Design a protein around this ligand. Structure first.
Ligand SMILES: Nc1ccn([C@@H]2CC[C@H](COP(=O)(O)OP(=O)(O)OP(=O)(O)O)O2)c(=O)n1
Ligand SMILES: [Mg+2]
Ligand SMILES: [Mg+2]
Lengths: 406, 557
DNA sequence: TGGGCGGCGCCCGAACAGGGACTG
DNA sequence: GTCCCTGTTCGGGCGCCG
């Protein structure tokens, strides 16, 4: 029996145009959809359904198997009372503290559960064609779609019945469901952890990605160490400490600022006085302390900001309010000589989102340092998760890049 | 006849009711044409007579048709359209001849009375009610309603396209080696079959369309090249655009410039080098379609060049999927770019232009990146593949720009082409302060109420300078201060500013700007040999910043 | 007189949104 | 708060197809 699903009051369905697809993704989608239609998972619809959600396809790593990926971000925003409140799943604070967390794709399960008939229209999508040989061919789901916030919500009771025996027997393993995946964490040794995972798979016969969140530390703000300081050096230092005091109000600057009195050449050398030396060491100390008054608000959304530091280096901050960071960090890569900023950026978005899902049960909204058209032209070439975060496109102010650099 | 296909269920929007609009007066000519059409349609069950039980009406009219002495019947369904439900449009783009592959055998068919062969939802027909008059005081009126898709209704194009697709589906499914380009009721049908076998398959297709109620009249059955299709002439090894005729007006009106630019944009797909920047400029301040605009001398030049371009014979070729796609880009002036896409050296599949101005201040590397991304998306649409690029930018220039630039940027596989004008950065900012170079601390202040301001500098060598400005702003006065320092310094200089605004513009290395002042700054920056720009927080008593700050403040209270 | 509909394209300008700097 | 500046979106001309 189906579960009646409503939309948020006052909101309509998604009307999002389909973006162009390469030939091989179109071929894969047409294969996948012929199979899905034959199995009853989807049905052809026409243009009197006014809703649309974009579709595309990704390939599993070292695989030849394509995967259909529906961008249900709008539909998810428009059902957010249903999946977040009415049939929500709680998030465990111990999951992030485990030695190992394995991610298991459990999405297939949803295709066994029928979707409410009144709601199927909202799941409409359109397959396009090379050179517009044909108008778009339209479908809608007849079963819980992968990628819809409603699917794990509705499937929650079955998943709990399925996991009750395994949880009972293995009571120190924590299992957290997020949208298409199970996150399975334990403090076992890697040999015995893996067998426990390839024990849960046998159970789930009614791949995997390995994570070590107990080793995720924070990236402190840090100040330059040098035995010779120029007027330029001290101007840079004072500017950075001035910005930092918006976060750590104990940052003091006047004893360094006093070294700069007058109109001097940028390259002239300036010995640090005892007063300024002690001020600088005290500032170094203050930066090591936790930021005061940062309390996670589970009602508000997460904001993730990213900066390109150059040479394969990226920095990022997760916050809900300005200057009150929940997390900071970096994403580093070897000097590739064939470096792809777009690919590195999507890899970074995925790592950050994975971390947020493990820590807060929430994906963040990304401020991305890239032109919209570049990102939209190429990001799906490198995407490998089933979820997709929200994002918007920003022109990072050069000073901000300078402040979080390492 | 009328297709036996299921109808598409169609609704009014919640709470709405059918249209009740009086009928216009019409020509004797249009009345006669409409009665001739409607008696035949009623005979064929495509429209049905209606009586006083239908409280709806919508005006009808008629227009001549393209290549005929025949009339198209239209209904001004704007009211019903506003009250009719939304549709999702399945026509996602316009097919392009350069995406066609060579075929041994080619046919073009035109479906007869296309809309009037697809039936309309039983429950929705009452709203399509119209009426033909005999004369304002002659007779009652014809007073029919539609049983099929009417021309004028917002729902008819999508419902027809979706119906045509459902009808073609089994035929495509059992004929994978035949390609059918389906744009609204015209069908391009290509195959590699010998002419005999191809004509048998064509007859199968036509019989199949007949079984679904769609005729293909022989008057519109094209069988020999050149085929007329989507605005082009398809020959066996090349395609051309049907001729583009530009106006030769003496006085020019805004509507005329719109028509001119529109024809130039259409021509730029095959004719290389079209530019419309100056013609487009002629539209900036306008406020009426009837306002006469005089051509600037620059617009005169641009239009003459486009004319000479259009006097040349040009053609495209078809796509060979076993060869690489190659896109080649050339810089023109003033934010304009041309490209050619080909697979063999002097045999274009198509051409194009990109001239969208983005940003107050930008440079040629940003613009070239935007052009590459546009060409990439257009190529994925037409051929489903990304092209290999030939670009007029040095690998080193691109390496430097992507290394120093703080936004993620990327360009797919490309090779350098050494035909000028080349794309360069025209100055670099130093990463470290310059030994020996004079250090200028600059600042500027502006009075919010009086608009007067001051800009100036202090240097480590004792030089001071302040200039007063009128009708200015804080941001303008900070740019003035930097400009002042660039003018007065030697070939190597360090500059300390407190304005994030000016720092942000200058670090992005613009080579063109909407602001005249930023253009002057750029000319100076290019003249320098080394420039180091530095930022300090304002109003903190720092360094020389404090001295300039005091100097440029006699308009801060 | 032309007058209706859907699709895609281009270019411009009006309406907003967001962030830095400033007032007393 | 106000003012300045910049970037995005969207409608409304026109072009082309049907
Ligand atoms: N200005 C126009 C042109 C066309 N359309 C629609 C879309 C295609 C369909 C063709 O009808 P249609 O009766 O077959 O007319 P055609 O000119 O193709 O003639 P044909 O029957 O082949 O002789 O009309 C429209 O709404 N507005
Ligand atoms: Mg026709
Ligand atoms: Mg200032």
């Amino acid at each position: 029996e189906t579960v009646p699903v409503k939309l948020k009051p006052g909101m309509d369905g998604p009307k999002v145009k389909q973006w162009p697809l390469t030939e091989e993704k179109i071929k894969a989608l047409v294969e996948i959809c012929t199979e899905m239609e034959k199995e009853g998972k989807i049905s052809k619809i026409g243009p009197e359904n006014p809703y649309n959600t974009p579709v595309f396809a990704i390939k599993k790593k070292d695989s030849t198997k394509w995967r259909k990926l529906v961008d249900f971000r709008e539909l998810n925003k428009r059902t957010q009372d249903f999946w977040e409140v009415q049939l929500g799943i709680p998030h465990p604070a111990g999951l992030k503290k485990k030695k190992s967390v394995t991610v298991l794709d459990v999405g297939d399960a949803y295709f066994s559960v029928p979707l409410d008939e009144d709601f199927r229209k909202y799941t409409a999508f359109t397959i396009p064609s090379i050179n517009n040989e044909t108008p778009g061919i339209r479908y809608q789901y007849n079963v819980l779609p992968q990628g819809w916030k409603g699917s794990p919500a509705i499937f929650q009771s079955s998943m709990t019945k399925i996991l009750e025996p395994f949880r009972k027997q293995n009571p120190d393993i924590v299992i957290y469901q997020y949208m298409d995946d199970l996150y399975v964490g334990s403090d076992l040794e890697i040999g015995q952890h893996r067998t426990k995972i390839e024990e849960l798979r046998q159970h789930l016969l009614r791949m995997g990605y390995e994570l070590h969140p107990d080793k995720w530390t924070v990236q402190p703000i840090v100040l330059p160490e040098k035995d010779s300081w120029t007027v330029n050096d001290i101007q840079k230092l004072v500017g950075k400490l001035n910005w930092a005091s918006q976060i750590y109000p104990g940052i003091k600057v006047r004893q360094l600022s006093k070294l700069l009195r007058g109109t001097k050449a940028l390259t002239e050398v300036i010995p640090l006085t005892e007063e300024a030396e002690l001020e600088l060491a005290e500032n170094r100390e203050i930066l090591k302390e936790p930021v005061h008054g940062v309390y996670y608000d589970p009602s508000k959304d997460l904001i993730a900001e990213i900066q390109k530091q150059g040479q394969g280096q990226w920095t990022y901050q997760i916050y809900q309010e300005p200057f009150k960071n929940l997390k900071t960090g970096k994403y580093a890569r070897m000097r590739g000589a064939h470096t792809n900023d777009v690919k590195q950026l999507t890899e970074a978005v995925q790592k950050i989102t994975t971390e947020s899902i493990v820590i807060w049960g929430k994906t963040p909204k990304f401020k991305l340092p890239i032109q919209k058209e570049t990102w939209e032209t190429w990001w799906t070439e490198y995407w490998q998760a089933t979820w997709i975060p929200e994002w918007e496109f920003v022109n990072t102010p050069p000073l901000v890049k300078l402040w979080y650099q390492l | 006849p009328i297709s036996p296909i299921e109808t598409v269920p169609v609704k009014l929007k919640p709470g709405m009711d059918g249209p009740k609009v009086k009928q216009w007066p019409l020509t004797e000519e249009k009345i006669k044409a409409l009665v001739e059409i409607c008696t035949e349609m009623e005979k064929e069950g495509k429209i049905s007579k209606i009586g006083p039980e239908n409280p709806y009406n919508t005006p009808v009219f008629a227009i001549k048709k393209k290549d005929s002495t025949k009339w198209r019947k239209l209904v001004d369904f704007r009211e019903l359209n506003k009250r009719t439900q939304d549709f999702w449009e399945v026509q996602l783009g316009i097919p392009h001849p350069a995406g066609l592959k060579k075929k041994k055998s080619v046919t073009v068919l035109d479906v007869g009375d296309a809309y009037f062969s697809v039936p309309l939802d039983e429950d929705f027909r009452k709203y399509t009610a119209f009426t033909i008059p005999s004369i304002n005081n002659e007779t009652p009126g014809i007073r029919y309603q539609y049983n099929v898709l009417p021309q004028g209704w917002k729902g008819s194009p999508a419902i027809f396209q979706s119906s045509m697709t459902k009808i073609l589906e089994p035929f495509r499914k059992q004929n994978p080696d035949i390609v059918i380009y389906q744009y609204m009721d015209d069908l391009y049908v290509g195959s590699d079959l010998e002419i005999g076998q191809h004509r048998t398959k064509i007859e199968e297709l036509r019989q199949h369309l007949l079984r679904w109620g769609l005729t293909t009249p022989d008057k519109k059955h094209q069988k020999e090249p050149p085929f007329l299709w989507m605005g082009y002439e398809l020959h066996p090894d090349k395609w051309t655009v049907q001729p583009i005729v530009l106006p030769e007006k003496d006085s020019w009106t805004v509507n005329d410039i719109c028509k001119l630019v529109g024809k130039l944009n259409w021509a730029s797909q095959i004719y290389p080098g079209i530019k419309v920047r100056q013609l487009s400029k002629l539209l900036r301040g306008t406020k009426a379609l009837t306002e006469v605009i005089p051509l600037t001398e620059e617009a005169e030049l641009e239009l003459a060049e486009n004319r000479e371009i259009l006097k040349e014979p040009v053609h495209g070729v078809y796509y060979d999927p076993s060869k690489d796609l190659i896109a080649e880009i050339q810089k023109q002036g003033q934010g304009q770019w041309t490209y050619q896409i080909y697979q063999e050296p002097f045999k274009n599949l198509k051409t194009g232009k990109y001239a969208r101005m983005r940003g107050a201040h930008t440079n040629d590397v940003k613009q070239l990146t935007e052009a590459v991304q546009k060409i990439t998306t257009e190529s994925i649409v037409i051929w489903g593949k990304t092209p290999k690029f030939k670009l007029p930018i040095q690998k080193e220039t691109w390496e430097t720009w992507w290394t120093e630039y703080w936004q993620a940027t990327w360009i797919p596989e490309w090779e350098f082409v050494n035909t000028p004008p080349l794309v360069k950065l025209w100055y670099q900012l130093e990463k470290e302060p310059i030994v020996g170079a004079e250090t200028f601390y600059v600042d500027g202040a502006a009075n919010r109420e009086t608009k007067l301001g001051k800009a100036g500098y202090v240097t480590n060598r004792g030089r001071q300078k302040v200039v007063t400005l009128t009708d200015t702003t804080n941001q303008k006065t900070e740019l003035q201060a930097i400009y002042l320092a660039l003018q007065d310094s030697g070939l190597e200089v360090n500059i300390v500013t407190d304005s994030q605004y000016a720092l942000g513009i200058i670090q992005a290395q613009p080579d063109q700007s909407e602001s005249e002042l930023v253009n002057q700054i750029i000319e100076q920056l290019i003249k320098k040999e080394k420039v180091y720009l530095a930022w300090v927080p304002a109003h903190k008593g720092i360094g020389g910043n404090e001295q300039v700050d005091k100097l440029v403040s006699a308009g801060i209270r």
